[PDB]
Amino acid sequence: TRSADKVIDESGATQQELNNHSVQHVETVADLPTNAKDGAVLYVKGYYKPTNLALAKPYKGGSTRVYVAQRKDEDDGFLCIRGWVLQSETSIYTPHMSGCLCDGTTDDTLNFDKLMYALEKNNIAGKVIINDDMFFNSQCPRIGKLIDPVQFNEKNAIRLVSNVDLEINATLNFGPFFAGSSTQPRCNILSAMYREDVNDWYGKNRHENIKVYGTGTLDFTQTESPNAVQDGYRWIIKASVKGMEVYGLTFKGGDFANAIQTSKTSEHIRIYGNTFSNLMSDKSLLHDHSTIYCIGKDIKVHDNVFEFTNVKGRLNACACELHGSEQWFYKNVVRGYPNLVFSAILRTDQSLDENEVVYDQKAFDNTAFISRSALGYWSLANKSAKLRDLEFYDNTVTFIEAPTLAQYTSAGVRG
Amino acid sequence: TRSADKVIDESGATQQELNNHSVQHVETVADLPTNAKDGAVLYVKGYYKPTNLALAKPYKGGSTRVYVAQRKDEDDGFLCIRGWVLQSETSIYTPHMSGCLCDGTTDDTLNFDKLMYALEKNNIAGKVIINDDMFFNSQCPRIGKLIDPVQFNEKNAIRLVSNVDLEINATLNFGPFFAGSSTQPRCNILSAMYREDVNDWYGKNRHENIKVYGTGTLDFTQTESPNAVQDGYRWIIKASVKGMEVYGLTFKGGDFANAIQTSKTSEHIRIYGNTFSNLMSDKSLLHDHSTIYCIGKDIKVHDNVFEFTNVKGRLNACACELHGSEQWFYKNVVRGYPNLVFSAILRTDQSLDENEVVYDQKAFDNTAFISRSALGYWSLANKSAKLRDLEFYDNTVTFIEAPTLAQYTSAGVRG
Ligand SMILES: [Cl-]
């Protein structure tokens, strides 16, 4: 029974010196050993044990990790597990790598926030790719930029992060947790809204370079509730941002006042190639929906499909509200909405200052099959905000009949 | 003290046979050993030692490498370090992997060119992702397609490469090296301009499939100088290219005659989703700026933000010059420029041949807040080039007052 120190290699090195320099493996993060040499390397085959060794990708959320003895007590379940530090040169991550199951039915809210909060907390630029279906059904931890010092009590599933691409190529299912109620009426499902103190209602510390995109689907069917009441604070994405892009995605079901709303000081938003389908249910008590609610400057909303096939959205809904300057709505299709576009000049603290003059609102090359209004102009009465110019050109509009009182009653419309 | 050859495995193989087949690790490229078995594999944890083991990504520019004994003297500091050959199946690279620090203050010009020149020299198609801030402050080596046989003496920071995506998701800072002077007035910061001999002024050997994109920023503030003089040869990107795309990026500060100029025989350029901000300083001796200078055919300039908030660019600047055929300028916003678009029909060796007829110049759906000209038509006097057609349609133009003589003097405008 001789020492590894006593065995010698055709290089002249101890088996012991070689063993200290060997890339080794363990099955799962649970198997990360607690007394390894500082600087040890492990390939971890999967986050958890394989659920089924017969299927094509048995091992999920595998990682290469280096042990950093001085961080051995840090366990974020992602970048550093009991000092084993995740190696990812290109900063491209998946939810499996933070212990998400991605089985479409396990609530992955907590384990997904271990990924997103890690990238937030460490100012990491990168990409999160979602290739497998997920379920969200609980509150995303209110830490870091998801603290709620104003106490709006918006339900959140996902922490958006500055300089992170969220690439959604599978179905995200949102569950009944996120249904509205009289007691907690508000929601912001994928939050890009940082409020630093009790006074910071509109997110003065803007996020930067938010990208939400991909070929997947965000399904809010399971959030639909007769209990949900009208509140302006019901969003798929509420952002305070400089530089945001939301593209490619299908959004369907739920009870939202808006799919996407920006904030007072927001700039450079691009919303394109998406499908917005039935974002306000028949049977809730909501009674108003505007799919996109454009606050701030340089916002372009284009090449999107807006559709209501239910009754209630065919009786009161608008595809886009233009609340500020340099806001264009172009090359969209709008199916069944009463209202195509609103120019809304509201002299109110969430948007326009006293004496503010709004310029460069454009709406062009849209198709609309609508029953009520192609262009709506709103303001408060007797206030100091003014519109310089709005151009509404080259739109192809067909006015169609709204659903009947019989269809309203057959569909159980409430609200 | 027994031979590894004498120790035997539950497989019946020598510890020596196993040791020859073990993936091993070293800390840094400096640690790459000089007498390993041909075919040995090392995981190199980082390019350099970690700067700080407490932070989230302690190890940067880690690599897997195979020793190729026959290349043991080749050291490009990237694909082959003393015969250790970099393994990267998808050809996705980062500047850390060539020994860039990416700390935003160390001059990474040389180490970044070790990456770009390697991909050039070996005709490698792939992607370079930049997720961390960099600084450039010296001349990019004049080798390969950056040789200067015409002796224009353009200062260059970055070698663009055919069939390489440059993905910039952080801030690139350009330093005072790149400031103009009377002695070396010319620059081409990210060069896609190959000139093969002393006679090849306009890049006859076009690059192919240049992509420059991302969510980041190119900051030329530190290049701004009272010493910089007007020269046409002052560019962020001067390309001779077939197939180029520049998208998503913010460009700000500096003293450029153009942000982007193409060449006589260039084709299929797409310039979109960018922000061009203050690309000519108040205090330099430059007196003319056109953001985009379109030479060749099939060039589309769209969905960009052009802005001068300084004085000098609010007194002489144009967003786009159309110098050739199939050139469209559309869906842009232009803030503060005197001039929106120029149709420039110059019968000159850098562009139009004798008797050349320019066709299909279009400018549509733009917003402009400008003080001098919506559409400018230029030519040389008494020459043989002609314009067939220019269409300028569906633009929304507001003529605003230029800055005052007081604002000019308060801003120290020179030039
Ligand atoms: Cl049109």
Residue numbers in the entry:
A (entry chain A), B (entry chain A): 153 to 567
The authors write:
The capsular polysaccharides (CPSs) surrounding the A. baumannii cells are the primary receptors for bacteriophages encoding specific structural depolymerases that determine the initial step of phage–host interaction. The genomes of Friunaviruses encode only one tailspike depolymerase (TSD) specific to a certain K type or several K types with similar structures or linkages between K units. In the obtained trimeric structures of the TSDs APK09_gp48, APK14_gp49, and APK16_gp47, each chain contains a particle-binding N-terminal domain and a central β-helix domain, as well as a C-terminal domain forming CPS-recognizing/degrading parts. All depolymerases studied were specific glycosidases that cleaved the corresponding CPSs by the hydrolytic mechanism with the production of monomers or/and oligomers (dimers and trimers) of the repeating K units.
APK14_gp49 structure consists of an N-terminal domain (residues 153–277) that possesses two α-helices (167–173 and 261–274) as well as four stranded β-sheet (176–241), a central β-helix domain (278–730) having 14 rungs and a C-terminal six-stranded β-barrel domain (731–851). Rungs 6–12 of the central β-helix domain are rungs, where B1, B3, and T3 are solvent-exposed, and T2 faces the three-fold symmetry axis of the trimer. Rungs 1–5 have only two β-strands, B2 and B3, and rungs 13–14 lack B2 and possess only B1 and B3. The APK14_gp49 β-helix domain is stabilized by 10 salt bridges, 79 hydrogen bonds, and hydrophobic interactions in a manner similar to those of APK16_gp47. APK14_gp49 crystallographic trimer has a diameter of 75Å and a length of about 150Å. Each subunit of the trimer has an interface area of about 2948Å2 (11% of the total subunit area). The trimer is dominantly stabilized by polar interactions, including a total of 105 hydrogen bonds and 15 salt bridges, while the hydrophobic impact is relatively small. The trimer has two non-interacting cavities in the central β-helix domain and one cavity in the N-terminal domain. In contrast to TSD APK16_gp47, in the APK14_gp49 trimer, the central cavities contain solvent molecules. Cleavage of the A. baumannii AB5256 CPS with depolymerase APK14_gp49 resulted in monomer 3 and dimer 4 of the K unit.
